[PDB]
Every structure is written in structure tokens, then in C-alpha cells.
């Protein structure tokens, strides 16, 4: 349980990691010289938190050289690379040393909610919830740590040509405007996989369940829904379209509408999917066991949440077509448009630098190195490199209003930025109720979208309406609309 | 409604507008009462099923009637982000509109009599000014006087007090914007603004239209002007960077001198404070002065086209501190109101020597967010951020319990028909509400 | 209580107005007789509202006092502010 980390040992004033080691480590696949041989050479040492108190570290070998004023002059260890202090969801952030810390925390919490390809063998796994992105892309502005996180192989986003500008005001207060034409070409399009499982229990001769296409003349608990999609075995076939309130598994239980009741499994409301595959097998008890994975294509629409790698979260305010979106001197319309008001308060300069390095990487034909602590890459070098491709050194660009063609007085900032789509869609959150089911103990509405429950008119709401002096509304909500 | 329902405006009456997509679309000015942002927030909607309740909400809880709050006798909803930055850049003295653009803007006015005003410039080319259109936006014949965020204090005393060079000193007369640049001080949620005066002089319906007009017209003009933010607004000339680096180099040298004094016992404690407390106060003073000096230098280096300045002047979002942190220097990171503590044995991190009370060792982030933070400065900044997250995650329970206690103790207290304030027990708490029998909505600040 | 000396305010409160419009709208919705003209008014709310502006609503507001007494103020005797 003693948490520790490796560090480079340091002699009087020099490191022990000589060039002969890096040479052997380069040919690691040939001479089988790995990290173990490096540790055994006495070059690296595992130091724990309790030993760090007695250790004097050096952030980089530059600190070991002779300076005009000696700070320590008696170093004993050195850090391999300062970026290693970051975790997994924080290592994916480009230029995290250029953003407010809370933002990096909020991104570390959003990176886990971003869609992509969670695993390569997703067609075989029948998981209860899985979101797969149609066209994942590796980030143009990446950190040298992603090569180890395998983010290059299983990315979770798309590089979007984002423009930081106020266009019609539909992107205000942490919102974004998307390009409908891009969405039509599969921009951020994804699929939602949901797996439904069921089994027939033979607990006793008194009552036994069985999968079979139910029948009105013999079944008792049959809903108003049609069971024609169900096969004779009661299970449904792949490739069939299923909507909410439909049946996918026809199960019946023998009684003590005679001698048997319907115990079928219906789909969740507001799903409207297609059956991807159906599997049948035997559980531990040797009873028949079925799993049905429904597939539903989720097209990005108004209300879907998007987020970059810097805490810049927001919902799609509106979707404008390519004719209505702004454009540069050349036919480059922004895939996404964000409100500049989200930058000053949050101070996410990394978003701007990423948007710059992405434009340079795309025009140069490389992948931007956004390692956090790298003195070899700053905003001036990126600006100079961008001026060589015929673009403004600060990333700005003249845009033309898509509705009237007139130039925009303020040269807008535009460039490629890696955005991510979050599992928090609006179709999974939209809820309504009007004289639905109620609980048993108290004849009040249910709880949850899954049960067609009602919203909670809590105490805080009662207090608010008391302040308004609205006695009739407060009465209708607590008595006539809840449990008369 | 939106949860947590803090104040009475967190549940307002709205008129339905049916549209295709599956989201609750709100006006942007009505997002401030609910404290709602569009980063995935969810808000409930209750539909009354009776004409009594429908009329009750239509006369007691509608949005127009809830603009001004008795909590602080000032409007709670005001102009917002884009409409406030653009209205700032629209009412300037150098904003001229052609006949085509004006006709495009006037088309978005509901309270327009259909008569185009004589332009402020008839030759050599007919040109209208932003204030000339805003005068049509302002309803009735209200009168107001405010001051822009950049209004200097040595102007109302000397000459040009009534003819401002910087176009400050907002003056509305007979419903016409005679002069001045509008911002949060004139259109925001402050007391005595053009909105508050519109709700007092004019009715609530007129103020409703005033809100809609500002949003529509200003957004349609911003569609022409445009607003953005980028690296060009966060960069400063080499002179400014040299002045900043010199200022910080001097601050670090002064702190080194303070450390040498205390180490040689050449520093005496102040009355009522310990030697350590005196040393830390002096160091904190030196660093705070350096942060303020560098911040002022960055603010002086910003051009009139800079978008950061355009955000802070109108007050739409941000402050001068944010600019100072993005351009010049982030500053000292504080944990529990004090510098970074010695988590290790007499050290903040194993990279520093023992007993190093210097600025870089105790958490002075001498770099800006644009130049990039060093590893240590990044870790310390993470500490400074984490304390904010912890407070934001802990205060919710204590404050919510306080809100509940306060309501349950005063939920039945009401103004009876004899103008006195009584509780459920019929006992008397105040012979007249607020000792004067007046409601907190119509009152406002004045001068004796 | 002596109707010759009513101490309550002569103006109609926002709550009294709300309940008056609500109850009168309900009455109109139940096909009750209308007092004023209905040139283009059908929605019971708009009808009750025009009736208030016209001051032709046949309702009496019984303002209860803390002591237990009450004062019956008719909709025509109260001064409408909004």
C-alpha cells in the first residue's frame, strides 16, 4: 500500500542515465533491454512519499548545471518528466498549464463522459449501456502521454473547426451553434446500444415461466401493444424496428386468459431503436437466458452537450446550415461556434492555444505537441509558424456574414479544436406527465422517467409560492394535481 | 422553475411558444433570476389546470411583474453577455449606420411608430448613429443619468463635465439617449438603471418590450459588427512584458531583502502581531503590490480594439483581475487565507530547499496563463483552485439548512388587512411593515 | 362591522385582483351572464379583464380583519391601480 514513483538517481552533480542507456532503450525490441534492466543498472529508483521528505529533487537536468547563483548544488534525484504528476483524464488535456485549475478538474470529470470507442470488441459485448461514435478522430493537438493511454487508438472526440464568435446570440451562456451540414455528413453522429436481459425460471411445478409468442385467447396480462413482431419463441428477430411501449421478449407464466398469464418484457419509453442482435444461452441454473441489444442512432441536435478538453462545456443552441454559417475568404465554415464570454471568466487560454496549434498542425501536416511543461513550444513560436501559411499570426481571420455576405467588422478567431460529445443527451432527459400511474402506499405520482413519474414540487417551491401569495396554485399543486 | 428555488423569481410565469426541437427555450435576460446557464441545466415546467390559477399566475407570478425584487429594490434581470458587450460597442460615438443597415435594425422593433428619424448626419452621406436608434428603443419619455465604467473622477469637477470627451456621463432625456456609453451600470441589475426607471415610470408590459427590443436589435447589429476573443487580445507589446519582468524581478529582490532582515534579526514585530505574522504580512504586501502594479501595466497596454477590455468595460463577463492573470501575472496562491504550507518537513515540495520562505517556494505564480505555468506553480495553482471547489461543495448544505430554518420560523408572518404584520397566532410583530407600511418594490435610493 | 366606517385601504390589492379575475373567468366559462360588450372576446380571462377595466364586476370582497370582524368591499368601490 506504500504509494511510490520512479525517479532518476543523481551523482555529485550529474545524472546516471547516460547516452548508452538511451541507445539500448531505442533498440528495445531487438536487444530485449527494458525498464527492469534500467532499474537494475542503478539509474532509476522507486521513491515513496515518506522518503521524498529526505530527498532533494531536480525538476529537469537544467537545474543541475552551474548557475550564476547556486540554489541547491547538492541534488540527489531528478524527475523523469514533470507532466507525469497528472493522471489519465488530465493527461489528455493540451496545455493544462495555461488554464485555470478548476477547469482542468471539470475536464477530468468530462473526459470520462465523452463518447468514442470504449473498447475494440464492442460488437461482441452485450453491455447495458454503450455509446459508440461514428467517426472518432485523434486530436491534432495531442500530448506525448496519450501514446501510452492509447487515446490514439481509441479516441473520444472529433477535431472541429470552431469559431469563437457571437452569431445571432444562440451560443450565449455556455452554449454552442453547430453546422447542420456537418451533422448531415456524420459530424459527432453516434449510436446508443442498450441490452435487455431475461430468463425463464422453473422454480417449481406450481408456476413456471417460458418464452413463447403470447396469445390473446389464453394470456391474461396482455397490454394493448401488438405482439406480432415477436417470433413463435416470443423473442424478437434482429433488424426489426422497435419503438417505445413495444415488446421484445414474450414470456408467460402458468397460473395455479386461463391457466397462464403474460410476463413479457417491454421496451423503455422513448427509445425508438432497432434490434442489433439477439443471443440465447443457458445460465448457471441451466435455464434459458436471452439478451437483446437494441441500437439507436443519435444524431447531434439542440440540447446535446458538447465539451472541449478545457472545461468549455455547452449545449447546442441551434443548428445552422452551411449557407447560413459564416465563412472565410475561402469556403471554410466553422463546424461549431462558441460565445467568447466563456473565455475571460474561466481563463481557458489552453483552448485558444489548442485552436492555434491545431491550425498550424493542419496546415503543416503534423501532430501538435502540447506537452504541459515544454519550453520549446510557446505562443510566439506557434504564431510565427502560422504566418508562414498565409494566415494571421494570432489565429484571427476575416469572416463574412452568411445571411448578407457582408464582412464582419471584427476579425473572428477560428481554428481546429478537439471537441467531445457527452452522453448527456436531451432525448434521455426530456420528461412529461399528465395523469399517469401512481404509487401504492400514497396515491401520488411515481418517481422517475422509467415509471412515468411526476416532478417533485418540493418544500422550496412551496416557500416560493407562499411568497407570491399564490394560494390557489399552491393548493392545486399540493392537493388537486398530486393526490385529491 | 429551476432547483434550488432560492428566491421568489426562481418560479415565474411564462407564456408558451410551441416550436420543433426538444429543449425549453428561454429568453437570455430571464436567465439571471434562475441563475441558469445552458451547460446542460434542466428546468421544470408546471401547467395550471384551472382558470383561477391561470389568472393568478397571470397577475402575480408573470415575468414582467417580477422584474424588480423587494430583496434589494432593484431589477434582478438585466441585459446579458452579448447584448451588453454589443450595446457597449453600439452606443459609442463612432458608430454610424447606413440607410440599409438602419432599415434592417428598425424592422426588429415592436415599439416602433414606423417613422424613420432624421439622421444625425445628412451630408455628404446620410448616416444614423447608434444612440439615435437606441433612442427609439427606449420607451416613453423617461429621464436618467448614469456613469460609464471608465468614467474618470477628475471630469465632473473640471471643464467638459456636460460634454464628455470619452462619451461617458449617460444622459437620457425625453426618452432619447442624448449622450453616454451604456454598460452594466446603465442596463444591468443595478439600482436606478434605465430598466429600473422603465419599470417605475412605465408599466411592466412596456419594460417587457424594452427588454425584447434591446435583445433583438442589438443582436442583429452584432451580426454586422461581430465580437470575438483570441490570442491577439491576450498578447502585449515587448515593452509591457519588459516592465512586468522588471517589476517581478524587483519584487523578488525585495522579498529576498525582507528574508535577509528577518534571518539576521533586523526585523521587529508590529504591535499586535507575531514576528512570523509580521514577516508574512510584509511579504504578502510586496507580492500584492507587484500584482497590482503589473495588472495596471497590462490594463494600460490594452488597445481600444482589445476584446478582453471590451468584456470588462461593459461588465458582461470578467474583471481587470482576470486580464492581469492572463497577461501579466497570476499572483500568489492562498490556502486557508495563508501561503502554501510546509506539507513536507519544512518544505512545500521536495524541489525546494528547507526553510525557503521565498515567493516561488511558497506559491507565487510569477507566470501568466498565456506564458504557461511551471510544474510547481501549476501544483500550487491546483491547490488554490481545490479550496474553491471544496467551499462550493460544502457551503450548500449549511446554507440550505439555514434557508429552511428561516422559512419555517417566518412562513406564516403576513401583513393583515389592518396594515399590521401578524403571525399565525394573531400576535403582532410590527405595527406597520418595515416600520413604514411600504412594499420593497416601488421604493428606491434617494438623497436628503 | 359598521359599513359607514371601513378602515381598510380603498385600493384593490394584487391578490384581490388575481382572485377576482380568476373567479369571474370561471363564472364566464360556466356560461354566466356578461355585463359588458364582447366585440371580439371569448377567452374568459380577457372578458373578466375588460369587465374589471370597465368596473362592471358583480363581486363583493369580504376582507377579514384580525379581530374577527369583516368589511364587505365591492369591486366598484375599490380603486384599481394596475
Amino acid at each position: 500500500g506504500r504509494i511510490c514513483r520512479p525517479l532518476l538517481i543523481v551523482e555529485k552533480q550529474k545524472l546516471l542515465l547516460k547516452k548508452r542507456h538511451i541507445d539500448q532503450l531505442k533498440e528495445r525490441e531487438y536487444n530485449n533491454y527494458s525498464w527492469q534492466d534500467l532499474v537494475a543498472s542503478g539509474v532509476v529508483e522507486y521513491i515513496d512519499t515518506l522518503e521524498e521528505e529526505t530527498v532533494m529533487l531536480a525538476m529537469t537536468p537544467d537545474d543541475l548545471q552551474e548557475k550564476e547563483v547556486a540554489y541547491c548544488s547538492t541534488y540527489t534525484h531528478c524527475e523523469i518528466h514533470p507532466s507525469m504528476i497528472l493522471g489519465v483524464c488530465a493527461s489528455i488535456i493540451p496545455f493544462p498549464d495555461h488554464n485555470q485549475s478548476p477547469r482542468n478538474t471539470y475536464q477530468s470529470a468530462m473526459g470520462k463522459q465523452a463518447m468514442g470507442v470504449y473498447i475494440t470488441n464492442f460488437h461482441v459485448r452485450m453491455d447495458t449501456l454503450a455509446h459508440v461514435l461514428y467517426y472518432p478522430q485523434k486530436p491534432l493537438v495531442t500530448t506525448r502521454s496519450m501514446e501510452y493511454l492509447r487515446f490514439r487508438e481509441l479516441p473520444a472526440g472529433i477535431n472541429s473547426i470552431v469559431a469563437i464568435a457571437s452569431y445571432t446570440g444562440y451560443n450565449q451562456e455556455d452554449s454552442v451553434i453547430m453546422n447542420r451540414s456537418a451533422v448531415d455528413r456524420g459530424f459527432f453522429r453516434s449510436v446508443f446500444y442498450r441490452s435487455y436481459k431475461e430468463q425463464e425460471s422453473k422454480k417449481g411445478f406450481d408456476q413456471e415461466e417460458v418464452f413463447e409468442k403470447p396469445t390473446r385467447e389464453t394470456c391474461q396480462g396482455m397490454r394493448h401493444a401488438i405482439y406480432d413482431k415477436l417470433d413463435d419463441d416470443g423473442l424478437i428477430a434482429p433488424g426489426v424496428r422497435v419503438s417505445g411501449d413495444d415488446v421484445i421478449i414474450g414470456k408467460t407464466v402458468t397460473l395455479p386468459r386461463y391457466t397462464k398469464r403474460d410476463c413479457s418484457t417491454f421496451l423503455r419509453t422513448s427509445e425508438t431503436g432497432i434490434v442489433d442482435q439477439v443471443m440465447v444461452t443457458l445460465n448457471q441454473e441451466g435455464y434459458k437466458f436471452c439478451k437483446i441489444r437494441v441500437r439507436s442512432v443519435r444524431i447531434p441536435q439542440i440540447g446535446d452537450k458538447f465539451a472541449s478538453r478545457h472545461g468549455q462545456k455547452g449545449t447546442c443552441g441551434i443548428q445552422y446550415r452551411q449557407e447560413d454559417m459564416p465563412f472565410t475568404c475561402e469556403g471554410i465554415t466553422p463546424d461549431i461556434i462558441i460565445n467568447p464570454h466563456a473565455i475571460p471568466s474561466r481563463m481557458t487560454i489552453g483552448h485558444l492555444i489548442e485552436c492555434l496549434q491545431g491550425k498550424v498542425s493542419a496546415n503543416k501536416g503534423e501532430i501538435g505537441d502540447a506537452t504541459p511543461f515544454n519550453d520549446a513550444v510557446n505562443v510566439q513560436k506557434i504564431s510565427n509558424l502560422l504566418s508562414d501559411y498565409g494566415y494571421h499570426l494570432r489565429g484571427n481571420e476575416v469572416l463574412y456574414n452568411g445571411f448578407t455576405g457582408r464582412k464582419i467588422t471584427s476579425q473572428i478567431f477560428i481554428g481546429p479544436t478537439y471537441y467531445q460529445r457527452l452522453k448527456h443527451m436531451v432525448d434521455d432527459k426530456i420528461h412529461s406527465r399528465a395523469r399517469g400511474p401512481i404509487q401504492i402506499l400514497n396515491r401520488q405520482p411515481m418517481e422517475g422517467r422509467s415509471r412515468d413519474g411526476g416532478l417533485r414540487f418540493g418544500e422550496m417551491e412551496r416557500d416560493c409560492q407562499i411568497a407570491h401569495g399564490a394560494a390557489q396554485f399552491l393548493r392545486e399543486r399540493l392537493f388537486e394535481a398530486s393526490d385529491p | 422553475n429551476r432547483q434550488p428555488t432560492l428566491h421568489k423569481m426562481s418560479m415565474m410565469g411564462h407564456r408558451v411558444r410551441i416550436l420543433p426541437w426538444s429543449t425549453f427555450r428561454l429568453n437570455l435576460s430571464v436567465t439571471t433570476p434562475y441563475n441558469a446557464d445552458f451547460d446542460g441545466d434542466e428546468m421544470n415546467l408546471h401547467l395550471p389546470q384551472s382558470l383561477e390559477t391561470r389568472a393568478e399566475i397571470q397577475e402575480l407570478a408573470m415575468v414582467p411583474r417580477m422584474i424588480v425584487t423587494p430583496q434589494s429594490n432593484r431589477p434582478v434581470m438585466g441585459i446579458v453577455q452579448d447584448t451588453l458587450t454589443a450595446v457597449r460597442k453600439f452606443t459609442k460615438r463612432d458608430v454610424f449606420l447606413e440607410r440599409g443597415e438602419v432599415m434592417n435594425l428598425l424592422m426588429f422593433l415592436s415599439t416602433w411608430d414606423g417613422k424613420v428619424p432624421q439622421p444625425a448626419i445628412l451630408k455628404p452621406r446620410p448616416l444614423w448613429t447608434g444612440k439615435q436608434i437606441f433612442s427609439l428603443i427606449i420607451p416613453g419619455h423617461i429621464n436618467c443619468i448614469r456613469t460609464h465604467s471608465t468614467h474618470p473622477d477628475d471630469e465632473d469637477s473640471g471643464p467638459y463635465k456636460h460634454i464628455s470627451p470619452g462619451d461617458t456621463k449617460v444622459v437620457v432625456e425625453n426618452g432619447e439617449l442624448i449622450m453616454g456609453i451604456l454598460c452594466k451600470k446603465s442596463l444591468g441589475t443595478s439600482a436606478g438603471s434605465l430598466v429600473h426607471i422603465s419599470y417605475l415610470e412605465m408599466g411592466h408590459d412596456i419594460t417587457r418590450l424594452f427588454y425584447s427590443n434591446i435583445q433583438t436589435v442589438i443582436n442583429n447589429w452584432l451580426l454586422i459588427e461581430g465580437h470575438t476573443i483570441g490570442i491577439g487580445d491576450s498578447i502585449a507589446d515587448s515593452k509591457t512584458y519588459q516592465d512586468i519582468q522588471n517589476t517581478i524581478k524587483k519584487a523578488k529582490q525585495d522579498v529576498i531583502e525582507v528574508i535577509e532582515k528577518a534571518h539576521n534579526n533586523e526585523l521587529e514585530p508590529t504591535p499586535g502581531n507575531t514576528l512570523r505574522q509580521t514577516f508574512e504580512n510584509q511579504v504578502n504586501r510586496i507580492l500584492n503590490d507587484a500584482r497590482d502594479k503589473t495588472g495596471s501595466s497590462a490594463q494600460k497596454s490594452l488597445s481600444e480594439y482589445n476584446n478582453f477590455k471590451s468584456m470588462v468595460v461593459s461588465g458582461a463577463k470578467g474583471s481587470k483581475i482576470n486580464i492581469s492573470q492572463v497577461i501579466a501575472v497570476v499572483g500568489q496562491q492562498n490556502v486557508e487565507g495563508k501561503r502554501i504550507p510546509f506539507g513536507f518537513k519544512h518544505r512545500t515540495l521536495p524541489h525546494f530547499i528547507k526553510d525557503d520562505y521565498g515567493p516561488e517556494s511558497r506559491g507565487f505564480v510569477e507566470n501568466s496563463y498565456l506564458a504557461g505555468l511551471t510544474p510547481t506553480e501549476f501544483f500550487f495553482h491546483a491547490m488554490g483552485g481545490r479550496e474553491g471547489l471544496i467551499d462550493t461543495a460544502v457551503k450548500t448544505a449549511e446554507t440550505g439548512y439555514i434557508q429552511r430554518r428561516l422559512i419555517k420560523s417566518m412562513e406564516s408572518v403576513m401583513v393583515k388587512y389592518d396594515a399590521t404584520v401578524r403571525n399565525s397566532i394573531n400576535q403582532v410583530v410590527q405595527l406597520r411593515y418595515g416600520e413604514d407600511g411600504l412594499a420593497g418594490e416601488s421604493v428606491e435610493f434617494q438623497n436628503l | 362591522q359598521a359599513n359607514q366606517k371601513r378602515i381598510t385601504t380603498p385600493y384593490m390589492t394584487k391578490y384581490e385582483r388575481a382572485r377576482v379575475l380568476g373567479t369571474r373567468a370561471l363564472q364566464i366559462a360556466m356560461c354566466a351572464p356578461v355585463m359588458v360588450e364582447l366585440e371580439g372576446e371569448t377567452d374568459p380571462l380577457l372578458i373578466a379583464m375588460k369587465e374589471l377595466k370597465a368596473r362592471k364586476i358583480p363581486i363583493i370582497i369580504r376582507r377579514y380583519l384580525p379581530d374577527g370582524s369583516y368589511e364587505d368591499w365591492g369591486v366598484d368601490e375599490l380603486i384599481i391601480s394596475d
Binding site: G469, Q472 | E411, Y417 | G22, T23, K56, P58, I59, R63
Partner: peptide, 29 residues
């Protein structure tokens, strides 16, 4: 108000602090 709310009655608050009576002297359509 908490008591009348628990009983689902018109709480003596705002619109509940008074009662409305019909005026037969004015009901003259």
C-alpha cells in the same frame, strides 16, 4: 399556512386571506 397546506385547504396567504361574495345588486345583464 403549513396546516391548511397539509389539509389541502386554501392557505390564508395572498389570495387566501379573504372571501368573495356574489353581488345581486349588480347582476343586471
Amino acid at each position: 399556512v403549513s396546516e391548511n397546506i397539509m389539509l389541502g385547504q386554501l392557505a390564508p396567504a395572498g389570495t387566501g386571506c379573504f372571501d368573495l361574495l356574489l353581488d345581486a345588486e349588480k347582476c343586471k345583464y
